[PDB]
Design a protein around this ligand. Sequence first.
Ligand SMILES: CCCCCCCCCCCCCCCCCC(=O)OC[C@H](COP(=O)([O-])OC[C@H](O)COP(=O)([O-])OC[C@H](COC(=O)CCCCCCCCCCCCCCCCC)OC(=O)CCCCCCCCCCCCCCCCC)OC(=O)CCCCCCCCCCCCCCCCC
Ligand SMILES: CCCCCCCCCCCCCCCCCC(=O)OC[C@H](COP(=O)([O-])OCC[N+](C)(C)C)OC(=O)CCCCCCCCCCCCCCCCC
Ligand SMILES: CCCCCCCCCCCCCCCCCC(=O)OC[C@H](COP(=O)([O-])OCC[N+](C)(C)C)OC(=O)CCCCCCCCCCCCCCCCC
Ligand SMILES: CCCCCCCCCCCCCCCCCC(=O)OC[C@H](COP(=O)(O)OCCN)OC(=O)CCCCCCCCCCCCCCCCC
Ligand SMILES: Nc1ncnc2c1ncn2[C@@H]1O[C@H](COP(=O)(O)O)[C@@H](O)[C@H]1O
Lengths: 120, 100, 459, 40, 49, 320, 347
Amino acid sequence: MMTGRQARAPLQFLPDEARSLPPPKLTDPRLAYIGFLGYCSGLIDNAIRRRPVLSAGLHRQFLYITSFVFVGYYLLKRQDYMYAVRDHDMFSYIKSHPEDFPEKDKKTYREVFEEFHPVR
Amino acid sequence: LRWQEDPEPEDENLYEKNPDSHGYDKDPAVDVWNMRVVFFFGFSIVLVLGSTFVAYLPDYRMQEWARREAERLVKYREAHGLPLMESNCFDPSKIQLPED
Amino acid sequence: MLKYIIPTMMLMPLTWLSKNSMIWINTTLHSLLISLTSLLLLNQFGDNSLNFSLTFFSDSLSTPLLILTMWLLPLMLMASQHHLSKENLARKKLFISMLILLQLFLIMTFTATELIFFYIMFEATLVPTLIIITRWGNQTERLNAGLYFLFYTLAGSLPLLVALIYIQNTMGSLNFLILQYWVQPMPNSWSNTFMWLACMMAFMVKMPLYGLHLWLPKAHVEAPIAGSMVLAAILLKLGGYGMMRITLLLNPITDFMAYPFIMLSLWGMIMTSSICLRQTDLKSLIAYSSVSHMALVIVAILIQTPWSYMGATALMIAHGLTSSMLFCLANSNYERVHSRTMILARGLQTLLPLMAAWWLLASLTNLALPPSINLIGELFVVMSTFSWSNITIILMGLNMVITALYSLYMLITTQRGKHTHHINNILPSFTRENALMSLHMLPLLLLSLNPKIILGPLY
Amino acid sequence: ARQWQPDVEWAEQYGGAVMYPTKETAHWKPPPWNDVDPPK
Amino acid sequence: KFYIQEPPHGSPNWLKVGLTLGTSAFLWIYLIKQHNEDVLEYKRRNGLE
Amino acid sequence: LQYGPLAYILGEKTTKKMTENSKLITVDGNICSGKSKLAKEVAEKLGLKHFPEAGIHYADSTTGDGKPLPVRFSGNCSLEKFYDDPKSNDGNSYRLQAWLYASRLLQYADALEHLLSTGQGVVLERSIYSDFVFLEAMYRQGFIRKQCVDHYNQVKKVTVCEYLPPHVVIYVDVPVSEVQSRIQKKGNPHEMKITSAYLQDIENVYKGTFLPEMSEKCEVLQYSAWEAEDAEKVVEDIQYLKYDKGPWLDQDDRKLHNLRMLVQDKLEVLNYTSIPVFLPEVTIGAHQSDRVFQEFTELPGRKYRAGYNEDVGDKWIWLK
Amino acid sequence: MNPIILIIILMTVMLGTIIVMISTHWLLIWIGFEMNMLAIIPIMMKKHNPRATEASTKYFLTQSTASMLLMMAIIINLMFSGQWTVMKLFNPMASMLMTMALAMKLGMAPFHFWVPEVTQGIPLSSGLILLTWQKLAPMSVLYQILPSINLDLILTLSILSITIGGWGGLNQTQLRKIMAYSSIAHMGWMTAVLLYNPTMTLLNLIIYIIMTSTMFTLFMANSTTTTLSLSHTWNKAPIMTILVLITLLSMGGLPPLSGFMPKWMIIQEMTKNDSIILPTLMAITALLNLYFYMRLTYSTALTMFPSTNNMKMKWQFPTTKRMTLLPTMTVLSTMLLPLTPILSILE
Ligand SMILES: CCCCCCCCCCCCCCCCCC(=O)OC[C@H](COP(=O)([O-])OC[C@H](O)COP(=O)([O-])OC[C@H](COC(=O)CCCCCCCCCCCCCCCCC)OC(=O)CCCCCCCCCCCCCCCCC)OC(=O)CCCCCCCCCCCCCCCCC
Ligand SMILES: CCCCCCCCCCCCCCCCCC(=O)OC[C@H](COP(=O)([O-])OCC[N+](C)(C)C)OC(=O)CCCCCCCCCCCCCCCCC
Ligand SMILES: CCCCCCCCCCCCCCCCCC(=O)OC[C@H](COP(=O)([O-])OCC[N+](C)(C)C)OC(=O)CCCCCCCCCCCCCCCCC
Ligand SMILES: CCCCCCCCCCCCCCCCCC(=O)OC[C@H](COP(=O)(O)OCCN)OC(=O)CCCCCCCCCCCCCCCCC
Ligand SMILES: Nc1ncnc2c1ncn2[C@@H]1O[C@H](COP(=O)(O)O)[C@@H](O)[C@H]1O
C-alpha cells in the first residue's frame, strides 16, 4: 500500500523524518515485553540443553534480554514511524480532497426518527 | 505375552500412616498447615470478612439514594398538584415529529 | 483490572519457585487472597459501569462471574491435590500453571472492553482446558473428548471472528461502551440473518445449545475434577456473558431469529433432564443437568427482558456453585470406589453421614429450593418466559418436576438404601473434602441473604 | 485406576504408511528408517 | 573428581563469557546513547528545550 | 563441540595422523576361547588401545562417574538369568541381546572416535559385526522368536551400514569340548548351565556366516587355542599383512571427516537402536518408562548436563 | 560433502534468491531462479540414496518447467511492452503464465504434487531450506507483479491450496509430508491476501517461516521423521514435547499464540474488501490443519506412548546437536501476538 511512499529513498530502516518523532521510552511496556521474551528464550536455552534453568549461564540470559531489547527498540521506532506516516498521508489526502470528505450535517435526536421495536 | 509394564499400584489410605490426617498431604506437618491455610484464609478471611464487606457495601447501585430521591420528587409534586409521573419521558416541545 | 491480572500472573513464579511440599499450600493461600481482593469490583453504580481503562471495564454482569472465577481456583487446587499426589513435581506445577493461566484468561475475558479482545481471551481459554482434559483426564476417551471440545468451539467461533471484524469495519469500533451509543438497528435480511448466526452460534456452542451439546458429556465427564469444576462453573458462562454483550447489536432481528433456538432450548431442557433420569454414570448425569440448566439461560437471554437477564445471571452464578459442588461430591465417591457408575456404591449415608448432608444440600440447590439463588434465577426466568408466552409454563413446570426427580434419584441411589456389601474401602470423609463442600455451599447459601449483587446490570 | 496411557494397540495406528488405509493404499509399506533403499 | 571423562562444560569458557558480557554491555551503552541522541534530536526538531 | 566443520576447514585432517599402525583389530572367538588376553597382548605389542568387551554396563563406564549403574537403569536385562532361564517368559534373552548390540555399537563408535581423532589403533573384542552370531545361536536354540530376529536385523540394517569394518579380524578356533572344559574350570555357576548345542551354534555361525562374509571386506586371521598363546606370531602376522580389501582404501579426508562427525555424536550413533517397533521383549510401557526415567534423573550427576551438577561439586554454573 | 563446498553452494542458493529480490530486469529474475535451482540440487542429494535422487529429479522437472513458463511470460511481456522492467505485466496471457510458473515454484495446488514427495525424499535440513527459503523468491516476484495478477486465478489457487493442503495432511504419519501439506495450506493463505494487502502476505510468510523453522529444528534436534518416533520424545527429552506442543498449537492458529496473528490479519484485510464468504471458508478449512497438528500433539506431548528398553542408553548422553536459534524461534513462534501491531514494519 505505502510502498511507493518509501520508494524514492529505498532500504531505509528509519528515515530522517523519523527523527521528528518521539522515540519509545526505555520503560515502554512493549519493550519490557520484548525483554521478557528474551528472558524466556534464555530459560528455554537452559532447558533444552539440560542446564539448571534459572541459575546456569546468567551472562547468556542477560545477552538474550539485551539482544531482544536492542532489536525491539528499533522495531518499535520503525512501527511508530510507519503509523505516523499512515496518519500523515491520510490527513494530507483528506485536506487535499475536500469534495470526497464533506462535513456531514449532524442532527440531534429531536429531529432523528428511529423506529421503535417493542420487546414483548 | 505383552510388554514390560509396572503393575497397578494399590490405592493408598492416608489414615493408615497418619490417623489424624486432614487429607491434604502425607506429611502430617504439611497436612496440618495446609488445613490451617485453607480454614483461616478461606473461612476466617474470605467468608467472614467478605460477607461483612458485602453487607456494608456503600449503597450498591444507588438503590437507597433512588428511594430517597423518589421521596423528594413525590413530596414536590404531591404538594404542587402535579401528576406523580408523566407518560412522556421527554418534553414534547423538544421533539420534532416526522410530518405527514 | 491490572490489580487482579498481575497477582494472577505472580501465582506463576509462586508455584514454580515454591518448595516441593509447599506448592499446594502457597497457591491455595495466595489464590484465596486474590479471591478476597476480588470484592473491590462491587463498586458498581446504578447508571454507569465501573470503567477502569480503554481495555477493561466491569459492570454488574462481569463482576459476579469474576468473583466466582477467582473463587473457583483455590477450590480447584483443593479438589485436585489428592489425585495428583503421586504425580511428577514438574507436571504438578504444569497442572497448576494451566489452572492459573485459565484464571488469567478468564478474568480478562469477562472484563474485556473491546469485543475482539474478548474473542481472543475467550478462545485463549480453550488451550489450557484442552491440555488439562487430555493430559490429566483419567481415561482413553479424554483424547476424543479433547477433540469435540476443541472443534465444536472453533467451528462456531471462527464465524464470530469474521462477524466481529465486520462490525469493526462497519461501526469503526468494537468497544462495548462505544457500541452502547452507536448501535444501529439490524433489519430483516439474509445478510443480517447470517450476521446473527455468526454472532450467536459460538456462544450457543459454549452454553451449550441443545443439539450442539454433545461435546459437554464427554468434556466434563472425561476431565479431571478441576477441569470439570471450571468447565461447568465458568466456561459455560462465557457463552451467556457473550450473548448478553452481543445481543445489543442484534436488534430487532433477534425477535424472530430466537424462535428456533428457544424451541431447541425449551424442548431441550425437557430432553436432557429426562436423560438424567436414565444416566448410569453419575458424572454424566451432572453434565446433562448442566445442559438442562443452561437451556433456561439461553431462553432468558433470547427473550431479552429485564427479568430474564436478571434471572439468567442469577442462574449462571447459582449453577456455577451448585454444579461445581456436585462434581466434587461425585469425585469424592470416585476417589474411593474408582468408578463413576452411580448404582455401584449405594447406602453411603450409613457410612458417610456429613457428606450425605452435603449431598442433600447440593441436591436441594440443584432442584432450586427457595430461597436459594438457584430458585431466584429459575423463578425469574419462569416469570419472564410466562410473559413471553403463557404456554411456556407447561414446559417450564414439567421441567421442574423432572429436575426434582433426577435430583433426588441421584440422592436416593448413592446415599440411601442398603450399602453395597463387597465395597469396604469407604474411608471417612477427609477434612479437605468437607472443606471443599463447605466452600462451595456456604457462599451459595449466603448469597440468598443479599442476592442483589448477582442480579446483573439491570437490577 | 491409574491414568490410561496408550498401549501398543493405540500406538500401532500411527505407524502405518498412511493414516486411513483404503483398498488402494493397502500395499504401501512405511519407508525405511534411515530413508535408504537397497541398490537392487 | 567425579566424572570418568572431563566434560566440555566442566570449566567456564572465559573467552566466551568475556565476549558475552562485553557484547551485552556494548549493546546497552549503544542503546542508551542512541536513545539520548534521539530524544535530543526530537527536542531540537520540535523546539522543546 | 571440539571437532566440527570449522576444525576441518582450519586444517585438522585425519590422514595427517593416520599412520601405518592405525588399525582397528577385532578379536573373535567362542565363550571361553581365551581371546581376552590375546587381544590385550596384541594391544601391548602394537601399542594399541585395548577396549575390553562391551557388557551390559559399557555405557555406564563411559558416562557419569564411570561406575556401573543399577540394572533397572542400564540393561534391564541379566546375562546370568539368560544362563539360568534361556526360554524365559519376561523376554530377557532378546532384551539382553538388543542391549548388548547397542553397547557394542557405542563401543565401536568410541573405537572409531579414538582412531580418527588420535591415529592410534584399537583392539576390540567381538564388535558389532560379530554380535549377530549370538542372535542366530539363540534363534537356533529356540531362545528367541523370529520377530526378535526381524527387529535385530532392522536395527543392524540401519546402524552397521554407517561404519567401516575392522582392518584385521582375529578368530580363535576353540572346540566346544575345550570351551566346556574352560567353563567348568571357570567356576561361574550360571555360565556352567550353557548347553552344548548353543556353543555349537555359536561356532557354526562363526565359521559358516561370519568369517566368510568378513573374508571379503577385511583380513581374517584364524588361530587355534595353542598357536594363539604366542602373541609374537600373531603380531608378526599382523605386521606383514598387505591391506588390499574393504572400504578403508577409498577413505579421503572428507569421508573420514563425515565418519568422525558421526561417531562423536552418541545420540546419532544410538538413534536407530530405539526404533518404534513394538516388540514385547523390548517394549517398555509408559508408566514404567516414566518411573524409571524419573528415578534415573535423581541419580547423582545425572539430573543436568555433566558440567552443571552442584551435588557432585560443579562450580561456576552461573557463568556456564 | 566438503564443508567449503557446502558453504559456497549455500551462499549460491542465497545469492540466487537475493538476485531475484534486488533485480529490476526480468532476465536477472530468471537467472536468480536458475542459479537457485542449480545450487539447491546438491543440498537435496546430500545423502546419496535413491529417494533423494528421485526427489531431486522431480524437483528439477517441476522447477525447470516453471522456469520455461516464466521465460515465455517474460518474452510475451517483451512483445507487448518492448521492455524488461520487473513491474506489472502488459499482457494477461503473460500474467497468467507467470502466475502459473510462480505457483509451480511455490508448489501451490494444483501444482502441489511435488512438495510432499520432494520433501519426504530429502533430509530435514534441506526440507527446511525447501519449505522456507525457497518460498522467498517467488513471493517477491508475486509481490511486484500484483497489478497484473488475475484475481480469479490467484484466489482459485489460494482456496485450492488451502483445501488440498488441509485434506492432504490428515492422512499422513510421516512428518515431512505433514510439513509439506502444511506448507501448501499456508501458501494458499499468503496468496489469498496478496491482491488486497501484500503486507499481510509478508506477515504470513514471516510467521510461517518462523514456525516451520521451529518445527524442523525440533525434528532435527530429536532425529524424528515419523509420528511414532516423535512419540518417543517424552521419555528422552520432555522439554521438546512442550516445545512441539506450543509450536503446533501456534501453527494451528489458536490464540493467544503467534500463528493466530497472520490469519486474523488476513481476515481483517479480506472483510474490508467486502469478501466475507472467502475468509470464512478459509478459516473453517484451516481446522483440518489444526486437526492433524492436534494428532501430533496427542501422540507427542499430551500422552505418553510406550518406549523401548534401549532408550535407557540414550538417557546417559546429552544432545550435542547445534539447535541453532531454537529457543529464540520457539519464543517468536508462540509469544508474539501481544506485539501484533509490529507488522507495520513490513509496509
Ligand atoms: C452473614 C451472616 C449469616 C449468618 C446466618 C447463616 C445463614 C446461612 C448460611 C449457611 C448455613 C449452612 C450451615 C449448615 C449446613 C451445612 C453444614 C452441615 O450440614 O452441618 C451440620 C452440623 C450439625 O449437624 P451434625 O449432627 O453435627 O451432623 C450432621 C449429620 O451428619 C446429618 O445432617 P442432617 O441432614 O441431619 O442436617 C442437615 C440439615 C438438613 O436439612 C435440610 O436439608 C432441610 C433444609 C430445607 C428445608 C428447611 C428450610 C427451608 C427454607 C427456610 C429457611 C430460609 C428462609 C428463612 C427466613 C424466613 C422465611 C423467608 O441442614 C440443616 O439443619 C441446616 C440448617 C440451615 C439450612 C439452610 C437451607 C438449606 C436448604 C437448601 C437451600 C435452601 C435455600 C437457601 C436458604 C438460605 C438461607 C440463608 O452443622 C454444623 O456443625 C454447623 C457449622 C457452622 C455453620 C456456619 C454457618 C454459616 C457459615 C458462613 C460463614 C461466613 C459468615 C459468618 C456467619 C456464621 C454464623 C454462625
Ligand atoms: C458473588 C458472586 C460469586 C459467587 C461465589 C462467591 C464466593 C466468594 C466468597 C466471598 C465472600 C462472600 C460473598 C457473599 C456474601 C453474602 C453474605 C452477605 O454479605 O450477607 C449480607 C446480608 C445483607 O443484609 P441486609 O441487606 O439486610 O443488610 C443491611 C445493610 N446494612 C448492614 C448496611 C444496614 O447481611 C445480613 O443479612 C446480616 C444479618 C444477619 C445475618 C442473617 C441472620 C439470619 C439467617 C437465617 C437464620 C434462620 C432463619 C430461619 C431458618 C431456620 C433454619 C433453616
Ligand atoms: C458450531 C457449528 C455451527 C456454526 C455456525 C456458525 C454461524 C453460521 C453462519 C455463518 C455464516 C458465515 C459468516 C457470516 C459472517 C457475517 C458477516 C456479514 O457481514 O455478513 C453479511 C454479508 C453481506 O455481504 P456484505 O456485508 O459484504 O455486503 C454489503 C451489504 N449488502 C448485502 C447490503 C450489499 O454476508 C455475506 O457476505 C455472506 C454471509 C453468508 C455466508 C455463507 C457462507 C458460509 C455458510 C455457513 C458456514 C458455517 C460454518 C460451516 C462449518 C460447520 C462446521 C464444520
Ligand atoms: C522480507 C524477508 C527477507 C528474508 C528474511 C530472512 C529469511 C530467512 C529464511 C530462513 C531459512 C533457513 C534455512 C536453514 C539454514 C540454511 C542452511 C542449513 O540448512 O543449515 C542447517 C545446518 C545443516 O546441518 P547438516 O549437517 O546438513 O544436517 C544433517 C545432519 N548432520 O544445521 C542444522 O541443521 C542445525 C539445526 C538447526 C538449524 C536451524 C536454522 C534456523 C534458521 C531460520 C531461523 C528463523 C527464520 C529467520 C527469522 C525470520 C525471518 C523471516
Ligand atoms: N547371547 C549371549 N550369550 C552368552 N554370552 C554373551 C552373549 N552375547 C554376548 N555375550 C558375552 O560373551 C561373553 C563370553 O566371552 P568371554 O568374554 O570370553 O567370556 C559373555 O560373558 C558375555 O559377556
